[PDB]
Amino acid sequence: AIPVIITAVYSVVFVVGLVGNSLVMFVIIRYTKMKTATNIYIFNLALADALVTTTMPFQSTVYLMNSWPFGDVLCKIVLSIDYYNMFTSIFTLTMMSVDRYIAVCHPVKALDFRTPLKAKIINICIWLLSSSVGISAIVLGGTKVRDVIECSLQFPDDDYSWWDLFMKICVFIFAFVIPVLIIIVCYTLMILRLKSVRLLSGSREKDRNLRRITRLVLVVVAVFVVCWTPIHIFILVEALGSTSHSTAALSSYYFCIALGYTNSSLNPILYAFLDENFKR
Amino acid sequence: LSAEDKAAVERSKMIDRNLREDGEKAAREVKLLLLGASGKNTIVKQTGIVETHFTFKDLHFKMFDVGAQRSERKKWIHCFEGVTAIIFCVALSDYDLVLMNRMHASMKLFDSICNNKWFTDTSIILFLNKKDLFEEKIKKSPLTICYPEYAGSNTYEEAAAYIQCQFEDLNKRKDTKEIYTHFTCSTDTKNVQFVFDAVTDVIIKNNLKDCGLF
Amino acid sequence: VQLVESGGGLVQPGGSRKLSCSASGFAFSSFGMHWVRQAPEKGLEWVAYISSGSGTIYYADTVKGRFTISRDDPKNTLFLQMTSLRSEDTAMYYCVRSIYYYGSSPFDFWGQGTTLTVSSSDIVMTQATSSVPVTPGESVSISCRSSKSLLHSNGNTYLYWFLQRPGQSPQLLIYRMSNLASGVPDRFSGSGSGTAFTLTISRLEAEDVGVYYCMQHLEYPLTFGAGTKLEL
Amino acid sequence: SELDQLRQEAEQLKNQIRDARKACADATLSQITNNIDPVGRIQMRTRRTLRGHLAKIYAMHWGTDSRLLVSASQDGKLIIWDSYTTNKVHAIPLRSSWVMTCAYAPSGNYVACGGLDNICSIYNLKTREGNVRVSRELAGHTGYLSCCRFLDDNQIVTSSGDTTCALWDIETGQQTTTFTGHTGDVMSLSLAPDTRLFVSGACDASAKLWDVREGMCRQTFTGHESDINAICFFPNGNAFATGSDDATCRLFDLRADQELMTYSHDNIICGITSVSFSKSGRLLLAGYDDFNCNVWDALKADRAGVLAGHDNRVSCLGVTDDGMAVATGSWDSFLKIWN
Amino acid sequence: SIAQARKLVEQLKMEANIDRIKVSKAAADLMAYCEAHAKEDPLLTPVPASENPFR
Ligand SMILES: COCO[C@H]1C[C@@H](C(=O)OC)[C@]2(C)CC[C@H]3C(=O)O[C@H](c4ccoc4)C[C@]3(C)[C@H]2C1=O
């Protein structure tokens, strides 16, 4: 019994996060520069992932002791930062997939589209789109008292208490459904186009490289789906109502949050340690 | 810095901006190096070195002919190292014409260009010219004059495939570069489109190099 | 190479007028452009400056907030818009061409000018010589003094010598110290050190009669000196 | 058969020339310089780095003022730089982007370029307008121009891939003198300081010393085993040095008509692109294909130093007139000034 | 052919009738020139930052 020792993984995917993502900027410091769109996207993803993994000790403390010994303004700031960087990471992943699709399937317009200027413009648009929910979490966030202390987005329960469920549906739509659909269709059309190229599909080593590309695509999609499915479906289950409020529900909820952090920890592993340009 | 030093710095920055714009314009163009022994007709028109510019499917093609350079190739071929593709024209009707045979000279030149150390990963688009004349003269003369080890039928298709295979067999280390072979015609501008298709493949590889997953 | 300005005329005080200058015969976008005015009985006064590419827009203190300098490079045209006109703006306006690189010759060409009539921490360039009587075939020296030393740390002395013939635009005689401009005969020489300068004409002709002006280029605002007039 | 008699006479004259050269060989330069103080170790570093070229740089030439320089790259760009402040003074777009040589006039009013277009283009830098335009297009060579050097504002000398050199009058636009006699393609030029004679090196593994006024080959030098790519006079005009593809530099003497010194290392197996001397001539700076330059002692044949820092093949180098700095251009699209 | 060989023979005859000095004298002249101009060489002898225009 006593399943609190899963706080140990709140150490593990903590440190390999901070070891990982920061080292990505070390590649920015030492090896690579902002001379291409993919380096800009990797830099944005690494910064957002490091900012996500910064938040982990707070929720580990909330898991260990069932209270919020951090205040109210700090609660709003940390919640807004978490939502901001979650949407930033998701959108940067999705638009990396769109960049790969345009590079492979449209290699004429990609000579004009895939430029650092348009990459910076799209990144600025992504940051501005996430700034809406950042502002909405700054404003509507707060702290409530149930004998415990709750740090979450606060809504008036006396009247119009359904705004929280609409928020959950909106972040499910703009955080899971559209990004997964876009990465699936972009990567599927990318692989089906790459099957017909005379290079990369000739004999032996070319087929090995094509299999390597396909396996990397499949493991990116698989880690995204596996890491982000349980937390979203547990939010949906808790909103509709199927599980009680015992310690099992809290432990499963915090393990789902652990997998959500495991996504942020494994993103630089399969976007910097496996990239061909970032390898040397 | 004084006033004129500051103005000189401003002028230099304007020059840098114009240079960056010109480089961005130049990077969106496809470079083709035209080579042959063997008939430049229907490939270039359809002193020094000859420039050709055309536009196809929003792609600007620059084509360079170096046939007027009656000098040593090894001292200027490195200028064409970063070329997108090398177009190589081989006549088919000169299998029995002695310059040494003309097609053996074409094979030697193809072996030199294809296996050059500046063209390790440079794609070659191979055009085989004068197929109608070759078909006309394949009945009155066999391929034994050029290939003693033919041992095949004296028809147009088998002989054309045999010469194509003999020219593609010179590609040593055929894992980083590809050879595209097309028999030239005069219908529906296909001779352009083939090149377009070929260079499109190269761009995809470059894109797979640019996105860092090749 | 020519610069023809247009506009001018009589403006009531408090009015507005847009002076224009059409440039021909040179690559206009590669040259910084200046507006320099001359009082109806006095010397040259610098008004405004626009750089090549319009990245640097600088003005004089007496016209700041009222004058606007602009350029249209496809139209090869320079504009000076004037609002809230005072009676001290009655002048003869010249449009000046100036390029800047290593070894360049700024202030090389001047326009004809337009007349404008309004009804009713700076280096002081001082040259006390005026109305100097001259004789043809004789060497004449014109002195020049500067409040601040014009010898920069790069070894250059930013001293410009100009000649104003009667009824003619100013012509660049010497651009940097001991540097003759193109088309100037080899009898003009320029020497000096620190704050002291001199221009020597070895054997003047009748075409060397006019008013000789100093200019500094160490710092903007660009101040002239009250010119020295040579008369036969 | 008169052909056999002429061949036998040519062989006899070659043997006579060899006998005269061996009779003029008393003691080697190493024997004389065995008792001089060696240069210990020279460690130059990159004072400047010029950026702005977006393709491989093939040539550079310094100015007489030892401050301005011109460089030529494959992007169709001839850029004139102020090396003291790293300012692009001029950017000249070329009609042909296949440029392999460039020159700068001693007066400083004109620049020249050429290459696979077989045309020497002379550009005027000082016009009434603010732009630099083509002042002359010297044509008449039937091979690629590999080098060009100014004698004055009106005379130029070019070396081409048609195995010939030429002396042109720029105002007339015609070949005043044609220098013939090379069997291989001429790669490099070097004028004497007194500007009355010049050396050329070709792909026939030979250098030829010509007189400009007489238009004839004074002397021929044959020591190398491969294509000579670079040539440069000694500062006194009585000797010169060559670099070739056999990984050797060779210092020849005009007055003895013989090779004086060989600069080679077993670790060097790559060719030589450019050579130049220092102001006193005791340093021989050679650019190689192994991405770095070597500073040799010209009197003792010792490797005095290494200039490393270029990420691609060093295509050209030049030394200023005052001997202040050495600027190298390479295929990594960067110029570096070393001191 | 015949004319080319005759021109080659004439060029070789012009090259053979050239007065030559010994390599010892020429090597001594080169060494003397390198000694007489050794002080005027910023590459051989490094200069301080006051006289160095590159920094
Ligand atoms: C990626 O790493 C963070 O994962 C988020 C995922 C959120 C999600 O899936 O949204 C659709 C989720 C689960 C929503 C509920 C949130 C909450 O009530 O307050 C927490 C808090 C309080 C102060 O700072 C943070 C964060 C919280 C538990 C969220 C996360 O942990």
Residue numbers in the entry:
A (entry chain A): 57 to 202, 206 to 339
B (entry chain B): 5 to 41, 44 to 52, 182 to 234, 240 to 354
C (entry chain E): 2 to 121, 124 to 235
D (entry chain C): 2 to 340
E (entry chain D): 8 to 62
Quoted passage from the original study:
KOR is a highly desirable therapeutic target for treating not only pain but also addiction and affective disorders. Specifically, opioid receptors primarily couple to the Gαi/o family (Gi1, Gi2, Gi3, GoA, GoB, Gz and gustducin (Gg)).
In particular, KOR–Gi1 and KOR–GoA are bound to a psychotropic salvinorin analogue, methoxymethyl-salvinorin B (momSalB). Several residues or motifs in KOR (for example, Val1082.53, His2916.52, Ile3167.39) have been identified that are important for salvinorin’s agonism, which can now be explained by their direct interactions with momSalB. Mapping the atomic distances between the ligand and receptor showed that GR89,696 makes closer contact with residues in the KOR–Gz structure than in the KOR–Gg structure (in terms of distance), whereas momSalB in KOR–Gi1 and KOR–GoA largely overlaps and displays similar strength. Notably, a comparison of these two structures reveals that the intracellular end of transmembrane helix 6 (TM6) in the KOR–Gi1 protein complex moves 2 Å closer to TM7. The calculated KB and α-cooperativity displayed a pattern similar to that observed in the saturation binding, in which Gi1 has the highest binding affinity and allosteric effects at KOR in the presence of agonists, and Gg has the least. Compared with the wild type alone (Bmax = 1,350 ± 116), the high-affinity binding sites for 3H-U69,593 were increased 62-, 38-, 14- and 7-fold in the presence of Gi1 (Bmax = 84,324 ± 4,214), GoA (Bmax = 52,086 ± 2,465), Gz (Bmax = 18,623 ± 1,468) and Gg (Bmax = 9,866 ± 3,493), respectively.
